[PDB]
């Protein structure tokens, strides 16, 4: 994820790693 | 679907923290 293009489910993979157990939102 | 941002460009670690709840 170190400077990569987060497309589709790849965006969900990193947001689960960055936010951790805090949750996130991406759509919409 | 018709729009993406961290996919076209590259988001850093701080920009991903702004998408968290």
């Amino acid at each position: 994820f170190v400077n990569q293009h987060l497309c589709g489910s790849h965006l969900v993979e990193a947001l689960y790693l960055v936010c951790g157990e805090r949750g996130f939102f991406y759509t919409p | 679907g018709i729009v993406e941002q961290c996919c076209t460009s590259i988001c850093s670690l701080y920009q991903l923290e702004n998408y968290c709840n």
Epitope: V2, N3, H5 | V3, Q5, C6, T8, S9, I10, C11, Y14, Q15, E17, N18, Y19
Partner: antibody
Framework: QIQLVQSGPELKKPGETVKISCKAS????????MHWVKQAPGKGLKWIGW????????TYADDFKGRFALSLETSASSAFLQINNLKNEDTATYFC??????????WGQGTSVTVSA | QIVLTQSPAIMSASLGERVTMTCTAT???????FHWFQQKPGSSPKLWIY???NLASGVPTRFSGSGSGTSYSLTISGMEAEDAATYYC?????????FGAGTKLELKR
Amino acid sequence: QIQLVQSGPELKKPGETVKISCKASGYTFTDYSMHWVKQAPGKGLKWIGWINTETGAPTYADDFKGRFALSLETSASSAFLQINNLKNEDTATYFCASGIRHAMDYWGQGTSVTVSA
Amino acid sequence: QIVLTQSPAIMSASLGERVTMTCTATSSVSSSYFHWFQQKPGSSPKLWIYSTSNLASGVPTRFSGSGSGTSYSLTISGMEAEDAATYYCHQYHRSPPTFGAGTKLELKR
């Protein structure tokens, strides 16, 4: 149509602070990102940073961290570049680039500031 | 962080000649994040070729891009008077995006 209009040319003294704008039109400003590229007088192109228009979180390159800030205005659908403590090496042309289909597509005008006495 | 080395920095060519410039990176670059920009004196840079080989809306068909990995190239079939400008190559990968040194295309006489 897709059109990016930048602010007029700026005249600043060394140590001052300048804040230029870049108004977007013809598309949803919040749906696509905004980039910024600097061009020294008659030299190459150097990347500064880009802003997440969906959120507002900006980032910058290693050579632009600190004295360079990036803001937005959702009501006017525009981006802003602010440089703090202007140096003689900051005299250049600053371009704002969009990012609809690909990175830095549809540029716009280009504001050139001169940092001198 | 990857350095795009364009060669030659300056080059001349007469009308109708096949102009070919080169851009070389320090590491492997995906073809989807390699582009070409054409800048004329007194005008903002415009996206000339995106994704290695795709022409923009407005570029004449005489332009063609190619290359993969660490070596890419921009080729003009028939050199025209309006093709005299500076051409930059662009990337997007492991680091903030990098630009090339630029290739100043001048008309030969």
